[PDB]
RNA sequence: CGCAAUAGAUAUAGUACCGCAAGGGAAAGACAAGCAUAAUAUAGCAAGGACUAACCCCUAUACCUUCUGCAUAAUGAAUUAACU
RNA sequence: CUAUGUAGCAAAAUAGUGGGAAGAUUUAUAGGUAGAGGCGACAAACCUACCGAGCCUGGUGAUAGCUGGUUGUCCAAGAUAGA
RNA sequence: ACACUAGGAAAAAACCUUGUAGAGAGAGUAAAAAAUGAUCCCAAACAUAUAACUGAACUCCUCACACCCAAUUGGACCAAUCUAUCAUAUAGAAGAACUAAUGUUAGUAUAAGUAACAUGAAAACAUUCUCCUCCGCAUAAGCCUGCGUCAGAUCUGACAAUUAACAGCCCAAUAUCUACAAUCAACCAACAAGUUAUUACCCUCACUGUCAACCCAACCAGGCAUGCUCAUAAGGAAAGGUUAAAAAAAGUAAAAGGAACUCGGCAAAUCUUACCCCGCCUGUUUACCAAAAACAUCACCUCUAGCAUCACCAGUAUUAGAGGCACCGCCUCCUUAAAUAGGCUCCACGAGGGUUCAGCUGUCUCUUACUUUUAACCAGUGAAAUUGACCUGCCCGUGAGGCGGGCAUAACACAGCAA
């Protein structure tokens, strides 16, 4: 039975789980885009979001500083968190990271995933667009837009 | 290597046998395989049927215009057209006489249909393969086309007639062609459509009103395997009775049996008298 | 325990070729409508993703060559500029990572 | 090796050829083909006796059906056709019942006639004149 | 060791008459010594049994099993050979007529398994699948059987 | 009226390899089984009688050896090929 | 002593719990004792994984009133006193 | 009578009927039907249409005939090979015939694509991070080129290397000597008692080891002496990816009660007490089911032996060998509520055996949650016992998946369980 347990089980125990997610999160803050196994990235996305939330409070706060000290291992990144990432998202109140699935890994055929922090300098991921607005179904729906707007 | 020769040769023979079941050779004229001399074969063809064919006429009854033309063209005598015509004409006349005398009531259309069936390709080819006409006949394409077998077979009958007279030829025809009517029902040789119309026509000719179709017996009216027994009547007297699954089919079969009874071609008719 | 009898080729065929063990035909493949390569719906075009990772790696090699050694995460944003592209009016005060090939058409 | 069987192949195929139509490994493995082929031939031999027994019981069944169609059990039909000195066997009685219904109707009528004659005679007192069909014909 | 498959690409048929239907071309191809079991390669071989070449390549590009890329390389080589040598017109006008996997040779240590992959590509479009047996077909065949009963064991 | 690659020497070799040692001691070179093409459909020593018809119907207690006969009471056999 | 392991990591191990641990202790190195013999703080304990008597070659194709086997076709005669 | 055929009494060697053997889609018979305790009863039914019919390999019929016993015995044929003569036959020969010896050798199956195995994370392939070790470096012993470069592959060939000062390899002869320990060697205290003079020579550095991820265990959580580092300056990686089922394994937590579990407080948690039996003590033993109450052992006693250069012994009756016993001293009714359990003197000791107080605890009343491995799924690599053939049901009876009589019954994976 596992009803209502939101935390995956990975590594050699709870502690190794936190440490694995910590290394993933450090790599993400250092490079702003990493390809990792899908389940691990899905577990780490929440932590990266809340890390940006803690980083918005700013250097002066001590709780946020302790948290970013634990969750960043090469400390050169703590400046970045408080001076490049958190400032970058002064407008967005949520959803700072985008997560996609990518071709499975060559060796062990695992389910992969690229995760990145929105707005970085890197070449943009090939996001999937929706169908062009000029397609047949969209045109008929646009006609319905007009005809319903005039009636109402 | 096991030392020996007998098992090796035995296995080679068995392999050859298997190799002559898959990929059988293209069939070829019996007049090319070994052990063949035409003269003995044609004389034996004569003596086998208990008939004194004249050797020259029988010889020219197996040669066809196709073969003459191919010999003329391949080189860089009489043909069997006339005998074939005589034989076909006599066969038609004699079969007509036979069927008319055996079955008097049958209409001329039906007699002509039976005569066309017996002298048709479907039966003549069958009677000509099982009496070694294809082996002796000369042609281009092997197997000989059924039309060429037919025309050669009637050429042979024509030779028989010109040699031993009408009566013996009539016995020959009674022996090989007429026998083919054995077992066959009437409307398996005389292929017709719309039988009820023909029944009404024939009944009118005998000045009696068209027949009333009733329902004599039935089982399983609603199911998918019904049985309807439909019985025609002619002024309160039965003249037939047919089975079927639909009432339409039962009526059609009642018409067929009534036609057979009026034409004297029932299942239990007096069997032909070969003696 | 151990088997009591060999299992025949018939039983083994009814097990091995049962549908539950067969490989299912995938109903979710298609063609990248613009790029024109195969892809699954919920996954990135493999060829496009590879051509993106190549450029990301080249950019990162330049970044490493400029930062010198480890422990040098800058405290300002970064912008990457290809040949014949002067730093725009918005990118002053941001580190520039020069590259020596024409900007890819897909890089916006 | 001085003498080695050079033709074991044909001795094997003599037994496998009779097993190509079997099911399993016992249509290509000699050790099993032999046993099942031998059982096959033993049943083939022993089955002719059952063939005769079964065709006879089928004929008795068909004759019972036909004779019951005419209100006359099977004991009566056979046990009173012979009393009329008709040596028709059961194969031909079944064939008549299927393929010649009215002839079988007549035979059933004859059997019922002889049965009635027997009952009337036995009911009487003495040796009153025998029935018109109950008169035997001597050799 | 029998090299029969690659010898069926050499049967020279007789020149066609202008009347008879155009004969669909063929190509037989084989990969020898695939370091992979046969009881696993069989599933991939059966997957692409009755589908055109392009759909087969699509289905194999996104399958996980190790032999998928081997089958894909084999099919690509087959397609290239078919266009280049066997005078096929359109490289997409082919379909997997026969796909099978067979045992292999090499030695043990615990058998080190091997396997060959055999593919026959037939020119033309895929044949449609055999349709399901409609109820009328079942009733028709049941009637046919009911209508072939003869009186058993008598004249 | 000797063998012809499981024979003939153990032999391509007393080598490889096993053993601390005495010592032991190989293999081989020139469409059989197993599978695929093609998974199965009530029922039963898997066959026979058959039948229009593959199944359906009726009949039918595997083989060897050992005990007085053995329902398999027990022993032996996965199966092919060679040698015995 | 318990649990794991039982073709196992191992043809006797692993984890814990335990006895000794300046002594009749433990141990590397070369030599010696040789099979009805050696050695033995006697347990029939040990002498190269299997010792109420090592292992190898030879006599040796040991012997076996015991077990198991014993190979083409077809026919015919053929069984339960006793010392 | 059976171990020989066939039909019946349900299945049925032993009761009743029947034998001399082949084909038949012919026939006549033989025997042969009930009356009025424990998984699930067991053919279904039937009171009154003339008694005959059914029923074999027995007998008759048409044809053909040597063509249904074990051990044994007689006979007629014969597969394949070699030789003589033909050139398949007549003869002569012989390693002369395999449905079966837990036969032997080779091939391939089944159990099975099952059990089991492996690569810490990110990356810019330069690097950074997380975590772990009684580990690491060297010599010795062992091994002998066994992750150096290049080129071919997924391991094969070529090329290259380990430089003596360290370590080994030693010595001219003859006589003389050579009483007192070592323990910081001085105090106390002991017992097991631990080279030169003469003669001969005025010569110089040759030879070998030197590599590595290593050796003995068939490839390995095992075995492996010494010096130094005592937690590491050295060395490494417990998770192929996923999900978080059962059963299993290891661990952590637990309400109230605290041995009621059980053979026994085994395991775990806690740390106390008291006695009894055996053995005096430390020690030794059944390498691989017994570590003990057995062996040995100081102490005592008995027996033999007056003595040279190979043991006892370079010893001598307070000695040596062989035996028994086991220091020393003393002699030759309570317990529990309840109970078959426990209760020559002789300190000390025991992983010895039995009992008890108090505590402690998931041992239990009565189980529960979480974590790790296993697990199930995806991907790679891929065994073994076992196997007559299987198209592998239940109940009752016979003597049981397979026989009989009833019942049930479309095919097919996957994970469990153990009748
Ligand atoms: Mg009878
Ligand atoms: Mg040899
Ligand atoms: Mg040899
Ligand atoms: Mg085969
Ligand atoms: Mg059984
Ligand atoms: Mg067995
Ligand atoms: Mg012997
Ligand atoms: Mg005896
Ligand atoms: Mg006899
Ligand atoms: Mg007899
Ligand atoms: Mg011969
Ligand atoms: Mg022999
Ligand atoms: Mg055997
Ligand atoms: Mg299993
Ligand atoms: Mg597993
Ligand atoms: Mg040196
Ligand atoms: Mg030196
Ligand atoms: Mg060194
Ligand atoms: Mg380190
Ligand atoms: Mg895990
Ligand atoms: Mg690991
Ligand atoms: Mg795993
Ligand atoms: Mg508690
Ligand atoms: Mg002790
Ligand atoms: Mg003790
Ligand atoms: Mg797998
Ligand atoms: Mg029972
Ligand atoms: Mg199962
Ligand atoms: Zn794309």
From Swiss-Prot, chain B:
Compartment(s) where it occurs, according to its Swiss-Prot or TrEMBL record: Mitochondrion
Recorded GO MF terms: double-stranded RNA binding; endonuclease activity; RNA binding
The organism's place on the tree of life at top rank: Eukaryota
Main localization, broad class: mitochondrion
Disease entry from the Swiss-Prot or TrEMBL record: Combined oxidative phosphorylation deficiency 16: An autosomal recessive, mitochondrial disorder characterized by hypertrophic cardiomyopathy, liver steatosis, and decreased levels of mitochondrial complexes I and IV in heart and skeletal muscle.
EC supergroup of this enzyme: hydrolase
Keywords: Disease variant, Endonuclease, Hydrolase, Mitochondrion, Nuclease, Primary mitochondrial disease, Ribonucleoprotein, Ribosomal protein, RNA-binding, Transit peptide
Family to which the UniProt record says this protein belongs: Belongs to the ribonuclease III family. Mitochondrion-specific ribosomal protein mL44 subfamily.
One Gene Ontology cellular component annotation held by this UniProt entry: mitochondrion
Keyword Ribonucleoprotein: yes
Domain RNase III: 56-186
Assembly: Component of the mitochondrial large ribosomal subunit (mt-LSU). Mature mammalian 55S mitochondrial ribosomes consist of a small (28S) and a large (39S) subunit. The 28S small subunit contains a 12S ribosomal RNA (12S mt-rRNA) and 30 different proteins. The 39S large subunit contains a 16S rRNA (16S mt-rRNA), a copy of mitochondrial valine transfer RNA (mt-tRNA(Val)), which plays an integral structural role, and 52 different proteins.
GO BP terms in the entry: mitochondrial translation; mitochondrial translational elongation; RNA processing
Gene name of this polypeptide: MRPL44
Documented EC number(s): 3.1.26.-
InterPro entries named among the record's database cross-references: dsRBD_dom, Ribosomal_mL44_DSRM_metazoa, RM44_endonuclase, RNase_III_sf
Record flagged with keyword Nuclease: yes
Domain DRBM: 194-264
UniProtKB/Swiss-Prot annotation, chain C:
Gene Ontology MF term list: RNA binding; structural constituent of ribosome
The keyword Zinc-finger is annotated on this UniProt entry: no
Subcellular location: Mitochondrion
Keywords: Mitochondrion, Ribonucleoprotein, Ribosomal protein, Transit peptide
Basic and acidic residues: bias regions: 91-103
Entry annotated with the keyword Transmembrane: no
GO cellular component, one term: mitochondrial inner membrane
Residues bound to Zn(2+): 32, 35, 45, 48
Chain's role: Component of the mitochondrial large ribosomal subunit (mt-LSU). The mitochondrial ribosome (mitoribosome) is a large ribonucleoprotein complex responsible for the synthesis of proteins inside mitochondria.
Protein name, entry field: Large ribosomal subunit protein bL32m
Swiss-Prot record, chain D:
Subcellular location: Mitochondrion
Keyword terms of this UniProt record: Mitochondrion, Ribonucleoprotein, Ribosomal protein, Transit peptide
Gene Ontology cellular component list: mitochondrial inner membrane; mitochondrial large ribosomal subunit; mitochondrial ribosome; mitochondrion
Signal peptide feature range: none
Molecular function via GO: RNA binding; rRNA binding; structural constituent of ribosome
Database matches in Gene3D superfamilies: Ribosomal protein L20
Pfam families: Ribosomal_L20
GO biological processes: mitochondrial translation
Quaternary state and interactors: Component of the mitochondrial large ribosomal subunit (mt-LSU). Mature mammalian 55S mitochondrial ribosomes consist of a small (28S) and a large (39S) subunit. The 28S small subunit contains a 12S ribosomal RNA (12S mt-rRNA) and 30 different proteins. The 39S large subunit contains a 16S rRNA (16S mt-rRNA), a copy of mitochondrial valine transfer RNA (mt-tRNA(Val)), which plays an integral structural role, and 52 different proteins. Interacts with OXA1L.
Family: Belongs to the bacterial ribosomal protein bL20 family.
Protein name: Large ribosomal subunit protein bL20m
Organism the protein comes from: Homo sapiens
Gene symbol of the encoding locus: MRPL20
Curated annotation (Swiss-Prot), chain E:
One CC-aspect GO term: mitochondrial large ribosomal subunit
Source superkingdom: Eukaryota
The UniProt record lists the keyword Methyltransferase: no
GO biological process terms held by the UniProt record: mitochondrial translation; translation
Keyword Ribonucleoprotein annotated: yes
Major place of residence: mitochondrion
Key words of the record: Mitochondrion, Ribonucleoprotein, Ribosomal protein, Transit peptide
UniProt subcellular location: Mitochondrion
GO molecular function, one term: RNA binding
Family, per entry: Belongs to the universal ribosomal protein uL22 family.
Subunit field text: Component of the mitochondrial large ribosomal subunit (mt-LSU). Mature mammalian 55S mitochondrial ribosomes consist of a small (28S) and a large (39S) subunit. The 28S small subunit contains a 12S ribosomal RNA (12S mt-rRNA) and 30 different proteins. The 39S large subunit contains a 16S rRNA (16S mt-rRNA), a copy of mitochondrial valine transfer RNA (mt-tRNA(Val)), which plays an integral structural role, and 52 different proteins.
Protein name as it appears in the record: Large ribosomal subunit protein uL22m
Residues shown, of full length: 41 to 206 of 206
């Amino acid at each position: 039975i596992s009803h209502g347990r939101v935390f995956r089980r990975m590594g050699l125990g709870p502690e190794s789980r936190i440490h694995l997610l910590r290394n993933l999160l450090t790599g993400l803050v250092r490079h702003e885009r990493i390809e990792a196994p899908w389940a691990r990235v899905d577990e780490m996305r929440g932590y990266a979001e809340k890390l940006i939330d803690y980083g918005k409070l700013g250097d002066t706060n001590e709780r946020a500083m302790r948290m970013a000290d634990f969750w960043l291992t090469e400390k050169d990144l703590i400046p970045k968190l408080f001076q490049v990432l958190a400032p970058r998202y002064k407008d967005q109140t949520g959803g700072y990271t985008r997560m996609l699935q990518i071709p499975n890994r060559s060796l062990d055929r695992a389910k992969m995933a690229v995760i990145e922090y929105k707005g970085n300098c890197l070449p943009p991921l090939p996001l999937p667009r929706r169908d062009s607005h000029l397609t047949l179904l969209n045109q008929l729906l646009q006609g319905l837009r007009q005809d319903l707007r005039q009636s109402q | 290597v096991k030392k020996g020769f007998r098992a090796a040769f035995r296995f080679q023979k068995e392999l050859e046998r298997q190799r002559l079941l898959r990929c059988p050779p293209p069939p070829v004229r019996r007049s090319e395989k070994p052990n063949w001399d035409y003269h003995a074969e044609i004389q034996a063809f004569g003596h086998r049927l208990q008939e004194n064919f004249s050797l020259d006429l029988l010889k020219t009854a197996f040669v066809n215009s196709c073969y003459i033309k191919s010999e003329e063209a391949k080189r860089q005598l009489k043909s069997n057209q006339e005998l074939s015509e005589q034989g076909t004409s006599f066969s038609q006349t004699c079969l007509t006489q036979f069927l008319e005398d055996e079955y008097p009531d049958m209409p001329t259309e039906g007699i002509k249909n039976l005569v066309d069936f017996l002298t048709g390709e479907e039966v003549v080819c069958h009677v000509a393969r099982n009496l070694a006409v294809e082996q002796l006949t000369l042609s281009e394409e092997f197997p000989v086309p059924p039309a060429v077998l037919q025309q050669t077979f009637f050429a042979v009958i024509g030779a028989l007639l010109q040699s031993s007279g009408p009566e013996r030829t009539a016995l020959f025809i009674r022996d090989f062609l007429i026998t083919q009517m054995t077992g066959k029902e009437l409307f398996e040789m005389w292929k017709i459509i719309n039988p009820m119309g023909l029944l009404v026509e024939e009944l009118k000719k005998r000045n009696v009103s068209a027949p009333e179709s009733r329902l004599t017996r039935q089982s399983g009216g609603t199911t998918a395997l019904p049985l309807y027994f439909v019985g025609l009547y002619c002024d309160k007297k039965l003249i037939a009775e047919g089975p079927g699954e639909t009432v339409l089919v039962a009526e059609e079969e009642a018409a067929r049996v009534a036609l057979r009874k009026l034409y004297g071609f029932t299942e239990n008719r007096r069997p032909w008298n070969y003696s | 325990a151990a088997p009591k009898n060999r299992r025949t080729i018939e039983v083994n065929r009814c097990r091995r070729r049962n549908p539950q063990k067969l490989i299912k035909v995938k109903n979710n493949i298609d063609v990248c409508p613009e790029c024109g390569h195969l892809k699954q719906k919920h996954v990135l075009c493999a060829y496009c993703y590879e051509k993106v990772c190549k450029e990301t790696a080249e950019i990162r090699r330049q970044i490493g060559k400029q930062e010198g050694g480890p422990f040098k995460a800058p405290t300002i944003e970064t912008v990457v500029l290809y040949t014949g592209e002067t730093p725009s009016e918005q990118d002053q005060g941001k580190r520039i990572i020069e590259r020596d090939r024409k900007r890819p058409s897909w890089f916006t | 090796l001085r003498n080695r069987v050079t033709d074991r192949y044909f001795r094997i195929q003599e037994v496998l050829k009779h097993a190509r139509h079997f099911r399993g490994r016992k249509n290509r493995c000699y050790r099993l083909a032999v046993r099942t082929v031998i059982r096959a031939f033993v049943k083939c031999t022993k089955a002719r006796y059952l063939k005769k027994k079964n065709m006879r019981t089928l004929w008795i069944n068909r004759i019972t059906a036909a004779s019951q169609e005419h209100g006359l059990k099977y004991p009566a039909l056979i046990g009173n056709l012979v009393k009329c000195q008709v040596e028709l066997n059961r194969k031909v009685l079944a064939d008549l019942a299927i393929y010649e219904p009215k002839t079988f109707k007549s035979l059933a009528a004859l059997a019922s006639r002889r049965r009635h004659e027997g009952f009337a005679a036995a009911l009487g007192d003495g040796k009153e004149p025998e029935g018109i069909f109950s008169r035997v014909v001597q050799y | 060791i029998s090299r029969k498959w690659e010898k069926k690409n050499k049967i020279v048929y007789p020149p066609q008459l202008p009347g008879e239907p155009r004969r669909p071309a063929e190509i037989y191809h084989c990969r020898r010594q695939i370091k992979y079991s046969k009881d696993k390669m069989w599933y991939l071989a059966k997957l692409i049994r009755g589908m055109s070449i392009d759909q087969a390549l699509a289905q194999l590009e996104f399958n996980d099993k190790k032999g998928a890329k081997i089958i894909k390389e084999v099919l690509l080589e087959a397609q290239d050979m078919a266009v280049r040598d066997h005078n096929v017109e359109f490289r997409s006008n082919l379909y997997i007529a026969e796909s099978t996997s067979g045992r292999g040779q090499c030695l043990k240590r615990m058998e080190k398994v091997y396997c060959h992959y055999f593919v026959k590509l037939v020119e033309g479009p895929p044949p449609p699948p055999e349709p399901p047996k409609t109820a009328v077909a079942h009733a028709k065949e049941y009637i046919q059987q009911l209508r072939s009963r003869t009186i058993v064991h008598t004249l």
